[PDB]
Amino acid sequence: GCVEVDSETEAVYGMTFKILCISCKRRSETNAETFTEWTFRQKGTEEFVKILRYENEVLQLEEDERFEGRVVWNGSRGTKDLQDLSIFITNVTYNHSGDYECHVYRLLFFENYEHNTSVVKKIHIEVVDKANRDMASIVSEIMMYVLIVVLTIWLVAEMIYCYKKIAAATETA
Amino acid sequence: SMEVTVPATLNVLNGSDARLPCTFNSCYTVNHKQFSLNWTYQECNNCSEEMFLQFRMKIINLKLERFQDRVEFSGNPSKYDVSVMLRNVQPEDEGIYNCYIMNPPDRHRGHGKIHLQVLM
Amino acid sequence: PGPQSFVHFTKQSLALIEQRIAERPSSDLEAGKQLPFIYGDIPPGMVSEPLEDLDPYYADKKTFIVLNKGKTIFRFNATPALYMLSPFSPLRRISIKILVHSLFSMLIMCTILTNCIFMTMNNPPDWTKNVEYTFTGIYTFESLVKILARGFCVGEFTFLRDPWNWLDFVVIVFAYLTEFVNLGNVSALRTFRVLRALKTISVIPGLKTIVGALIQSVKKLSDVMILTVFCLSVFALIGLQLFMGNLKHKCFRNSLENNETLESIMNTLESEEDFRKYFYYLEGSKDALLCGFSTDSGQCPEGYTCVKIGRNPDYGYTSFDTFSWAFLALFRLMTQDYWENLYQQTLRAAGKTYMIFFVVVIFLGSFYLINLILAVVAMAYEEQNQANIEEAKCSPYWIKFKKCIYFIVMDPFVDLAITICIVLNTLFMAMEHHPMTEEFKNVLAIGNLVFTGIFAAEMVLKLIAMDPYEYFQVGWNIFDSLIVTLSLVELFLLSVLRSFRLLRVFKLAKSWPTLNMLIKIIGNSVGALGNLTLVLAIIVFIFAVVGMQLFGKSYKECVCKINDDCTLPRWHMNDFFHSFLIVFRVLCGEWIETMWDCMEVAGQAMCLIVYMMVMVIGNLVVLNLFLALLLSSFSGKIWWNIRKTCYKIVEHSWFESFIVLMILLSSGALAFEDIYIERKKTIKIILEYADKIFTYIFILEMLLKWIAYGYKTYFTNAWCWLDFLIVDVSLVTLVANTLGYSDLGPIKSLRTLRALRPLRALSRFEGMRVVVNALIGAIPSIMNVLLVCLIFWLIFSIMGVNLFAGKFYECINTTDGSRFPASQVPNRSECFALMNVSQNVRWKNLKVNFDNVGLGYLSLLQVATFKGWTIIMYAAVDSVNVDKQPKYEYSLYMYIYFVVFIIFGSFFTLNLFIGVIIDNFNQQKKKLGGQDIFMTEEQKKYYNAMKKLGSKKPQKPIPRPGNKIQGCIFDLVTNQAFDISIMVLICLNMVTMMVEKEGQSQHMTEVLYWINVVFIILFTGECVLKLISLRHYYFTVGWNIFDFVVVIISIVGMFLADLIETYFVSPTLFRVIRLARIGRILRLVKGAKGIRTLLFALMMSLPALFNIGLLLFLVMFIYAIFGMSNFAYVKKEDGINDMFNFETFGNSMICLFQITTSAGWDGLLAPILNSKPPDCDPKKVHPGSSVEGDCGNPSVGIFYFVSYIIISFLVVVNMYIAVILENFSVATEE
Ligand SMILES: CCCCCCCC/C=C/CCCCCCCC(=O)O[C@H](COC(=O)CCCCCCCCCCCCCCC)COP(=O)(O)OCCN
Ligand SMILES: *[C@@H]1O[C@H](CO)[C@@H](O[C@@H]2O[C@H](CO)[C@@H](O)[C@H](O)[C@H]2NC(C)=O)[C@H](O)[C@H]1NC(C)=O
Ligand SMILES: *[C@@H]1O[C@H](CO)[C@@H](O[C@@H]2O[C@H](CO)[C@@H](O)[C@H](O)[C@H]2NC(C)=O)[C@H](O)[C@H]1NC(C)=O
Ligand SMILES: CCCCCN1C(=O)[C@]2(COc3cc4c(cc32)OCO4)c2ccccc21
Ligand SMILES: *[C@@H]1O[C@H](CO)[C@@H](O)[C@H](O)[C@H]1NC(C)=O
Ligand SMILES: *[C@@H]1O[C@H](CO)[C@@H](O)[C@H](O)[C@H]1NC(C)=O
Ligand SMILES: *[C@@H]1O[C@H](CO)[C@@H](O)[C@H](O)[C@H]1NC(C)=O
Ligand SMILES: *[C@@H]1O[C@H](CO)[C@@H](O)[C@H](O)[C@H]1NC(C)=O
Ligand SMILES: *[C@@H]1O[C@H](CO)[C@@H](O)[C@H](O)[C@H]1NC(C)=O
């Protein structure tokens, strides 16, 4: 089923970037009618500006110059029960760096009931020039190499020790 | 026939209170919209029936002139009870009292008949 | 002993008899037994006459005996019949002469058989009054003649001294009460007329001994029933304290208008629609969705809060609210009937953490107690059978043609030719499916014709060679003639008849020894145990007609409580057929689903009485029959230095333990690879690199093992071969990953073989090595019996395909999923028009049916494991034709096909299974020096030192202290009256814990609190009293140590309740602490020796069960990883809900423990089978993942679930049973 996976927090200059905002229902069987809005502030600036509003089927974006001609939808297609509100930036600039907020306006449908939920997903991304490898990846790689080398040295140490012992046992025979 | 328990003959002293006790029993659980109870009086065996109390979503007391305001409901129908009370019974109250109970979903209609006799 | 020796009953002889009484048993001559051959034949002038008593032990008393033509003995008293008629009187003479007669016996038998035929009418016509009058008259007449022959209450051998006449008396008394002035309960009085069907138990020969043997077996089952009640009660108190009111959770609304409150609603709403308008009610269920406060149990949809309010699920009968309902739910878990629904409901209500409670309850209560009942019934029957056995012991042209026919009948080759023809005809009839082109149909038809012609020619040749007389003298030949007649009748002149040639395959029995064993079982069912199967049939009939008479009035009257269309449900008791089907379904373990409906319509008291009588009685007899059948069946050279060093390294215990730890780590690193692995990317990375570390370590271990053992010693070892295979697969995967250009097809499909990495633990853990050795030793008989079962179910599945091939299609309406009324849209042609007109209709199959023989095998697996059979039985009995809309119970008698299948396939073949498997385990136990085959060596040492505890030796009681008041205390403590007083106090604490319930008064809770306080006070007082008595030697008894422990735990439970009340707030942990007081109850097994023996048997079987549980846990782990790999992302259709799916390791191991008892495996498999839309979606999005499609592989799903069923059968139903049986024998013998 759905997985609420956090978005990547490191966009690279001049290339593409998909900002994940995944807000799936607490019960998958219910049928809702979801639309979303995205707000954004550049780094070093203190307000929030709506950039695009996705609706029943079409994506309407505000007339800010920062995101004109370089934003396309990436969430669920043709569902009308969106359950995944993921914006895709093409040709990221140095202005797509700051705090994004993914407002999810879900309207569930029940027997005699129409609930109006609103989960706010906040994504902070920073644009850079070169893809920086994760500290987790680099430290786990060097740790794997260290463990492999330590196991090799332990094995050869025990090997040469038992070899000297076997040679000493054979010398007496 | 529906299981309705009433005394076939009920003998009451003039001036006392007469509880007309009837037991209706059917499967299922009673429904307020669903459960309907009707009580009628007759002065004699062949005499026209006069409805004097009904249950239709609640008790309706028809306040027949012949009873003044002496009729009261005296039963909790959810208990299969639909008894009525006739306060301060008078000689003219002698006659036949009929309880009719129709209970959805039960198709069958219960009927209890009491012959009330007034002593002296 | 001489023919002249016996003398007719004369007054002169009786005059001597009375004198011997005035002066003051031979089993061979017992009444009813056959007269021994020693006395020879009876002269015709003395038969059916009173004779002098031949037994001198009885000859003193006033008795006499009358002989039947068949040499049976009948004993009567010589007194006048009710002080009226002496034996010399003429009336009593003719009365006895007609009493002792096979004509009269068979008259009564046929009369009560016709009465049993008439009892099943369920709405008899007007004229049955004179039939019942005739039956009552015949009964009164036979009772009258036996009264005239014996005497009512006067005498030693009077009519009443034997109990089987009490029933004949009661039945006529009740019949005449009914005819005369009768009470108001006409139906509950007509129910009492069923004892006419018990009359045959005494009329028919032998049934009177079979029932006596059953009553003897119950006398042994007594102690296991006591322990069953005690264990169900202890686990019911635990389940009560845990889930009191948890089943009452319901996800309630949030936005209430008109100031409407929870209570203001609950007091005013009662209809299910009004309920559904406020609570969740998940789209088609009768009860609201269970909710949860705890994080794991979950989850109610946005806009709904969790609150415990309303009625419990399943009309109110599925709950742990009161102790009675907790006991009923734990009996439901102990008989494992629909226990998967209770599993899922209480887990959703409380949390997925209580899988621990359900594992304990199943793996102790259900399995251990059922295997204890089996072991005790087995021991009882075996000892009874052993005791019985020991105490018992043209014409010339015609002759030329016949010679030539015998010469060409070629015995050494024609028998084999006909066997090959039989097998070919079977494999030719098994090549039939629903969608068949006309060429295929014609091929099948001409093949059937050719085969039936071959068999007819062979039969006529054999007849003319051996002829009509000596030929038909043989059973197989008369059987083949019957079959060839049944096949030739349809040459040019029904398919149930057509499916009868398959029985010819039993001609393999003369060559196939295990098929011969199956024939022997089926024949012992109607032979040596024919009387026992007749008792079973009579009991099933009695219970069926009793259920009918008691509940068929209400069912018809009050259908709406148990159904929404106000029509009869699928399983009712309004007809004799459906009543019998319900009794059969309760013989199988499926009692509760119908007990709920029958309770709803006809009262809990009556339905509980009837269903518990059915369950207990009918299961006991069935169990006895199963046991009887099964038992009866049994009886420079630097390279060499390098090799030595690396061999020492490999054999080093440090290296062995390190490799075991790395195996455990590499196995546990698979549990993290679920759908939530896109999150926790750091753990994802450390796993992606630990994978390479582990692959390298295992490659180095393999190279060390090579250089240390040599290719010979290495590849001559199955464990090393398994390790080599797993490491080679891992190396292929690593090389592909590191080289690239490999993310396609085979590589991605062998990456999931990483689920086999746990298999490296078998070679290391001795507790799994021993179990795997035992199973691998047993596997040849498994193969033989699986082959026999395959051929038998092939017969049944060819029949099933011929009957239900392509008739399961229906016009479901996809919104609610309800068959169209078949008045409109009667066939597929109109269904397609309705599909053009509307959107939500779909001509859909069942996905598990008899469309071909493979699907037939699957449907039969479901019908024979009883988990998923109702959905097939319904559509079968509704089937009409090949392309017609099914009508509601239009066939209604393929229920007979499924009953016959269950009885033969499931019962008999599973009996063959258990028998051959326990027999193979006994052969292995013999071959291995007689020591147990499920324990390692350290476990065997532990087991011997533990069996030492079974000593009956009385130890030195105590040295009494010299101090006077201390010795007074010592005596008052050592008093047996004091001991029994403590026992009764424990029983009073037990009922104090039982009286609790959900929704009790605050005053009641306070009184129970203070009663518990006084109980703990008394217990601690007697403990410190025994201490002041025996300061030094109190702790030298394990039972006294346990008493000290449990009183400490009780006082600290009170103190912890105090400390929580002060500083903490946690209902769950508070409850689990309060669970401590079950210790104060568990002190009852101290005096109950019959319980203390079976508990010692369990303590004996604990190590072997630990090894079997280790193997089962490793198999469950491998299958859980295979699940998380394949069956994640599948559609959530049924049984694969939000909870209990295959998404993560928790959910996968939960579903797998559910399936470990075979429960609900049909529901778990159903969403996987669907593919090829519109049954699924092959390109879904799954937000948060890159995998598309939400349907699983049908083939891999069938293989997964069927292989897990078979494996967890082998391991859990045939090794748990074997361990329990051997260890219980060990316990009870010494
Ligand atoms: C928290 C625990 C979770 C459960 C995990 C599953 C583990 C399975 C546990 C099974 C418990 C089985 C222990 C039974 C031990 C009782 C044996 C016993 O008392 O025998 C006696 C041995 O003496 C002792 O060892 C005393 C030691 C105290 C034992 C405490 C007994 C507690 C009973 C627990 C009940 C078990 C479950 C019952 C239903 C929940 C002597 O035998 P005998 O009376 O002379 O009879 C010989 C006949 N020829
Ligand atoms: C299949 O069943 C659904 C309901 O179970 C039917 O839907 C109903 O249709 C009628 C008239 O078409 C409406 O008045 C109801 O309001 C509908 N109910 C619901 C719950 O939607 C549907 O019509 C059925 N299919 C066909 C072909 O009749
Ligand atoms: C399948 O069912 C349909 C509808 O009942 C049958 O339709 C026939 O043709 C028209 C269509 O309604 C009717 O006027 C005829 O009376 C129907 N024939 C009969 C015998 O009822 C159709 O015959 C059925 N069988 C098929 C299509 O093989
Ligand atoms: C082809 C052989 C298929 C195996 C059939 N199979 C069962 O029938 C049960 C399901 O129903 C049971 C009821 C019991 C029992 C075992 C089972 O032992 C105690 O009572 C089971 C549990 C685990 C693996 C297999 C099975
Ligand atoms: C992004 O746009 C710039 C021009 O503004 C262009 O030079 C560059 O090639 C583009 N990059 C991609 C990946 O489209
Ligand atoms: C990004 O911001 C800078 C200064 O803040 C501005 O000069 C530039 O025009 C912005 N980008 C676009 C596409 O307008
Ligand atoms: C997101 O949009 C891009 C087009 O800019 C497309 O190539 C990509 O497939 C989309 N992603 C998803 C998941 O649909
Ligand atoms: C409530 O729903 C309306 C549309 O029905 C929407 O415009 C509004 O934003 C929603 N508000 C919240 C808090 O969800
Ligand atoms: C519906 O009927 C039309 C003819 O009117 C036919 O062309 C079409 O194939 C049909 N489709 C279905 C789905 O029945």
Short mmCIF file of N, CA and C in Angstrom, two decimals, chain B residues 27-28 30 105, chain C residues 557-558 560-561:
data_model
loop_
_atom_site.label_atom_id
_atom_site.label_comp_id
_atom_site.label_asym_id
_atom_site.label_seq_id
_atom_site.Cartn_x
_atom_site.Cartn_y
_atom_site.Cartn_z
N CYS B 27 -41.19 -13.33 19.08
CA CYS B 27 -39.74 -13.30 18.91
C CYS B 27 -39.31 -11.92 18.45
N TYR B 28 -38.00 -11.67 18.46
CA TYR B 28 -37.43 -10.38 18.05
C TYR B 28 -37.45 -9.39 19.19
N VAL B 30 -38.77 -5.44 20.24
CA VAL B 30 -39.76 -4.43 19.87
C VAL B 30 -39.17 -3.15 19.28
N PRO B 105 -41.17 -7.29 12.92
CA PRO B 105 -41.58 -7.87 11.64
C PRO B 105 -42.62 -8.98 11.73
N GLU C 557 -40.13 -19.23 11.73
CA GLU C 557 -40.84 -18.12 12.36
C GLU C 557 -40.09 -16.82 12.49
N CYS C 558 -38.85 -16.94 12.91
CA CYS C 558 -37.96 -15.86 13.24
C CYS C 558 -36.71 -15.75 12.37
N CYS C 560 -35.81 -13.46 10.27
CA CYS C 560 -35.24 -12.12 10.16
C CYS C 560 -34.14 -11.74 11.13
N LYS C 561 -34.06 -12.36 12.29
CA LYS C 561 -32.99 -12.05 13.20
C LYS C 561 -31.64 -12.53 12.67
#
